[PDB]
Amino acid sequence: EIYELEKLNYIAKVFSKFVNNNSTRTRIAKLNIQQKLILCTIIQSLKLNSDATIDESFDHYIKAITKTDTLAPLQRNEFLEICTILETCGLVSIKKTKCKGKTKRFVDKIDVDLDMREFYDEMTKISILKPFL
Amino acid sequence: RFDLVYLVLDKVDEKNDRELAKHLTNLYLEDKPEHISQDDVLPVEFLTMYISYAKEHIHPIITEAAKTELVRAYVGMRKTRQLESMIRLAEAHAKMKLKNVVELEDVQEAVRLIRSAIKRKLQEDLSREIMNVLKDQASDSMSFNELIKQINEHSQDRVESSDIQEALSRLQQEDKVIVLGEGVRRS
Structure with a gap:
């Protein structure tokens, strides 16, 4: 119907939907240079491999x-x-996720699909995150 | 043995240092401070005359009536040099405002004075580790290196090897632990 719509071609159309942002379109997600800064800020908080709250990330951000x-x-x-x-x-x-003090209480734990190998390439092009590493 | 210490720390923030910069530029607003007289401020020549009259005309006595509030002001720092400093502080409070007899309210502020004039994890872990590598060394010395190594070894609280160097210096100099050699570390 694609050749009806235009009046393994489609498996080629469907896999690029899935493979991308890590190689190329990571910088597409972070046109903001601060979005590049906040993305490295998450991974610096991941040293304490804990329930990565939006506050503990904000703690390391300040x-x-x-x-x-x-x-x-x-x-x-x-x-x-x-x-x-x-x-x-x-x-x-x-x-x-789970924290069980008073009731089933919901703090927000994040998880990143990027690796430091696919991080280090896209940050050496910008020496303003280089103070932060 | 020092009678009075003063924590004159800044601790920089907003709505304070802004008034500091504004007061420093307010005399830069005009080229001459001729407008300094319309405020509650005594002149220098009247001040030194009042001070010279009060220093040579008033011999105040410290009565027994201010006994009860002094005892309790001493035990709060105890829970004799401070007592000798605060009685001279209370008699100087009596020296001002033309008084010959000391009063009960005059020591309250004095103590507030010495309480407002003065207003561990690191070294603890440090020693802790030192003890550890000692133990695991059959008590032999901890190395600079291994020290730094185990001490950054924990991601949590980031002990920077410089900070490490510093606190180490502290304990050793505090004589708690001994370190020798420029290139090595001793527990």
């Missing part, structure tokens, strides 16, 4: 941005919207 003054520290509410820009492209997923 305490690094006071050391290197690349930008002003932004809001948590801004930090809410910017990580959702990272979300809709399909890079990082957010789930409401």
